Amino acid sequence: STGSATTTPIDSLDDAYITPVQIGTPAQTLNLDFDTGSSDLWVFSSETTASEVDGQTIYTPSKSTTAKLLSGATWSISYGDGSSSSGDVYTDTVSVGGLTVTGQAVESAKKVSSSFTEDSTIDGLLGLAFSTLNTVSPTQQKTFFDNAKASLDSPVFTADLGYHAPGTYNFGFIDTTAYTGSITYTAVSTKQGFWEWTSTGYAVGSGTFKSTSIDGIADTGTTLLYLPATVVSAYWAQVSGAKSSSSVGGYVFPCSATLPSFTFGVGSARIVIPGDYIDFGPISTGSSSCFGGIQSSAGIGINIFGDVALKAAFVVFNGATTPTLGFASK
After folding, report:
1. Which of 15, 85, 131, 170 has the most other CB atoms within 10 Å of its CB?
2. How far apart are the first and last CA of the chain?
3. What are the residue boundaries of the Peptidase A1 domain, all occurrences included?
4. Smallest Cα–Cα separation from 128: which of 160, 85, 157, 100?
């Protein structure tokens, strides 16, 4: 079997992408943020404290004929931005674009941090990293992809994110019409539980390609591209007036500037991020300063190929026994 769902940017900046997911019987549709940087499927629910719910669609397991409390199990997660959520665990039928999984652990949020409360468009997260990162205790749970692998035609899922436009998450097949040329596959290290890989280098605009190993994670759940300070400083030195701001917390540039492209290597292939993708608009309404799409990973400890990088390519997450990441131009 296969699955295919449209993902849509939540705002005019592509801050996040939401995909409709059906949970329970009769189905309850929730718009979840597909995150390849985490492994928990958690949703806002009838158990979440009323003051922390601000317009999200909630999951109500008492109205689902297939819901079962996963007795004793609890979860607790914290993300890279400082946000967090916790609660109890239910099992239910979960379907993504026609692909159905029965007995999927759905983590019901009891408490959510203010960052999630203010994002009314996002009803929860659907983790797509390796199951070793799942926070359900004492019995660690499997992600939706891991549970679905048994039914899929091929143990792959693809991400085809759009620039200020809807995109597609496919499960179990590769759409040869979504990309140009061929797909370049690179090795994945599952050691930290992430889709970790090594980029063969970078170029700034029309400059020469610098062959250097950049280890990082393919993360659909992170908006920006976080790279080593040496790479970031070389990109932003090509934009007049660009500077790292402490009050903002990162590189900013004059909104009047034209940003160069950024190329990253995948084996012998090159993936070009156009300059426009690196522009995140004014820091505040009417501002003359614009927020940059490429930021330093120095304070994070890990390089993250987030949505800015992934949306420039058709990305294959091959979850076979030896996992690989495939990238193609689109």
Report:
1. 85
2. 25
3. 17-328
4. 157
* Residue that has been written with the tokens 């296969």 in this structure: 2
Dist. CA 271–CA 273, nearest whole Å: 7
The domains of the chain are located at 5-174, 175-330
Q: What values do phi and psi take at 166, rounded to 5? A: -60, 155
Contact in structure between 183 and 241 (CB atoms under 8 Å): no
The pair of structure tokens assigned to 42 is 């958690």
Of the residues 64, 95, 199, 297, which is catalytic? 199
Nearest to 137 by CA among 188, 204, 186, 70: 70
Sign of CA dihedral 317, 131, 265, 205: positive
User: Quick check: is 199 catalytic?
Assistant: yes
Nearest one of 229, 8, 1, 31 to 123, comparing CA atoms: 31
Identity at 15, one-letter amino acid code: D
Question: Is 284 a residue of the active site?
Answer: no
Strands across the sheet with 303-305, in order? 269-273, 262-266, 196-204, 210-218, 303-305, 225-227, 294-296
Chain length of the chain = 330
**Could you tell me which of 155, 145, 129, 117 has the C-alpha nearest to residue 21?**
145
Which of 14, 33, 35, 40 is an active site residue? 35
